[PDB]
Structures are given as structure tokens and as C-alpha cells.
């Protein structure tokens, strides 16, 4: 509600997707999605901006060594 938002983005689609997203992680997805719009000079955050940040936030293993499964 604080950010301008696309006004066409469906926030529910991101919520329906699973993953162990903490409150801090959810804050990162929203803040990064707004930041990505600022980087591309868009005053209104866009649906595509949310997905890229969402993937960035779900870094998950990120590194790891494959063995240790």
C-alpha cells in the first residue's frame, strides 16, 4: 500500500507461490522491485520488476557444493 504499485500487478500470484519467505524476505522483494523500477526510471513499479526481485530474494542455496545434497 505504501508504494505506488503497477495497479495491474496481481500480488496474490506471488503469495500463492510457495518457498519459506520470511517477513524480512517479503520486505526485500517489495523494496527491490521498487528499486529495479527506479534503476529503469519507472515511477510506477511494474509486474516484471516484482518477478526479478522475487527470484533474487529466493537465492535459496545460492552457493553450496552439490554433495551434502
Amino acid at each position: 500500500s505504501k508504494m505506488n504499485l503497477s495497479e495491474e500487478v496481481d500480488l496474490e500470484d506471488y503469495v500463492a507461490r510457495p518457498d519459506k519467505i520470511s517477513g524480512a524476505d517479503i520486505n526485500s522483494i517489495c523494496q527491490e522491485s521498487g528499486m529495479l523500477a527506479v534503476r529503469e526510471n519507472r515511477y510506477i513499479v511494474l509486474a516484471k520488476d516484482f518477478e526479478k526481485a522475487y527470484k533474487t530474494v529466493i537465492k535459496k542455496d545460492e552457493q553450496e557444493h552439490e554433495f551434502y545434497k
Partner: protein, 239 residues
């Protein structure tokens, strides 16, 4: 955690193996990167060859090694360690013909090479070996096959694989390319492999630096591409 299993191959709180994890880092200590790309009917290995001094033979310094007529590998890691693995892989491939009456499947060479590595981790009195091996060969009923093994003993089949200092970025370029639906022909696979090194390193290397080894369905033998052939591909991709 650190200060626990740092000096021995023993378990740590959280079940982490420090000495084996350090071995993956030693592959990067080599300072070289390799990329391997599978194709509709082709498997291509590309590596960067750095000649440190003019007074050194380009032919002698090769990280592309044939293991069997139909099987070739690229070794990334400490040079001595890479060569020891090559002798073991050649011996195991030869035994497979000697004890089973047929040539080793590329999948089977990896399991045998990985199993030797795993034993070194479980039992002490051995350094894990600072090298990673990528094996390319054509298997009837499996198509061209690209396979990779790790110091830990992990082995896997990869549509495209990279190793060395730039592995993470190289895989990232490969991920975008692989995501594209189009399959890659011999020209495209040589191009994708060379471009992957080019984008990751930004060298725009001359024909001498890149060493390319290719195995094809039409010519099953592993062939080390000559410098002239390497240049012809390098000029064409630039257009």
C-alpha cells in the same frame, strides 16, 4: 565449525567436511576456466591455454587429454593432480574393454573416477586431489554425452558445464543460452562454447589461446582441433 575439522577429513558440527570443501577451491587456484557444451549430434570441450613464456612448447602444455579413442576429457585444477586422474581414467577404461569385452560408457568412466575420489574422502591418509574432470564421448542410444566429476566424488551429467575460476558466471551465460529452445549444431556448439569463455573472460582470445576438442556422431573419435580450424570458427562467430 572452523578450527574443528580444518586439519583432518572428519565430520564437523552441522556435518560439514572442511578438507573436501577446500579441494573444490584448489581447482580455482589453477587460474584457468573450461567450458563443455552438448549438442544435437556433437560434444565440444573448450579451455583457455596460457603460454606463460615464449620459451615453452605450446604442444606440451595441453589440458585436453584423450582417455580412449572415443573418450576425451578436459582437466581443470592442479597439473600434477589432473595427470594422475588421467592415468587412472585410462586404466579403468582399458580394464573395461579387458574385463567386459566392450568400450567404457562415458557415464561408467565417471562413476569409477568418482568412486576412487569418494574413498579418499571416507578413509584418511590421502589428499582429495585438486582437479575436476569433464568427459565427452558419444554413446549409442544415449547421443553425445557430457559428464563432470568433483573432488568430493560427486558426478553428474550436464547439458552444459564449466569449471575453474569463472564457473559460476560461465554457467549463468550457458543457462540463458540453454533456456533458448533451439538445439545446437557442431558450428553452434563450438560457437556457444567459445562465446561463453569470451563473454566471461572478455579476452577476445586469438586462435592460439583457446584449445577445442570435439567428438561427433559422424566421427566418434575424440579430435583435438588444429589451430587453423580453431581460427576459422573464431573468425566466423565474429562475422
Amino acid at each position: 565449525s572452523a578450527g574443528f575439522d580444518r586439519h583432518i577429513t572428519i565430520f564437523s558440527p552441522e556435518g560439514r567436511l572442511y578438507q573436501v570443501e577446500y579441494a573444490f577451491k584448489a581447482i580455482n587456484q589453477g587460474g584457468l576456466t573450461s567450458v563443455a557444451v552438448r549438442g544435437k549430434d556433437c560434444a565440444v570441450i573448450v579451455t583457455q591455454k596460457k603460454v606463460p613464456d615464449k620459451l615453452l612448447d605450446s604442444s606440451t602444455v595441453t589440458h585436453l587429454f584423450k582417455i580412449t579413442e572415443n573418450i576425451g576429457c578436459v582437466m581443470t585444477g592442479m597439473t600434477a593432480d589432473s595427470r594422475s586422474q588421467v592415468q587412472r581414467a585410462r586404466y579403468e577404461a582399458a580394464n573395461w574393454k579387458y574385463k567386459y569385452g566392450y568400450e567404457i560408457p562415458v557415464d561408467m568412466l565417471c562413476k569409477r573416477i568418482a568412486d576412487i575420489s569418494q574413498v579418499y574422502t571416507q578413509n584418511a591418509e590421502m589428499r582429495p586431489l585438486g582437479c575436476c574432470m569433464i568427459l565427452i564421448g558419444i554413446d549409442e542410444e544415449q547421443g553425445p554425452q557430457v559428464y563432470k566429476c568433483d573432488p568430493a566424488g560427486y558426478y553428474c551429467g550436464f547439458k552444459a558445464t564449466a569449471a575453474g575460476v569463472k564457473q559460476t558466471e560461465s554457467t549463468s551465460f550457458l543457462e540463458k543460452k540453454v533456456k533458448k529452445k533451439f538445439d545446437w549444431t557442431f558450428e553452434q556448439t563450438v560457437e556457444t562454447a567459445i562465446t561463453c569463455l569470451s563473454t566471461v573472460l572478455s579476452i577476445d582470445f586469438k586462435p592460439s589461446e583457446i584449445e577445442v576438442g570435439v567428438v561427433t556422431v559422424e566421427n566418434p573419435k575424440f579430435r583435438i582441433l588444429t589451430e587453423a580450424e580453431i581460427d576459422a570458427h573464431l573468425v566466423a562467430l565474429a562475422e
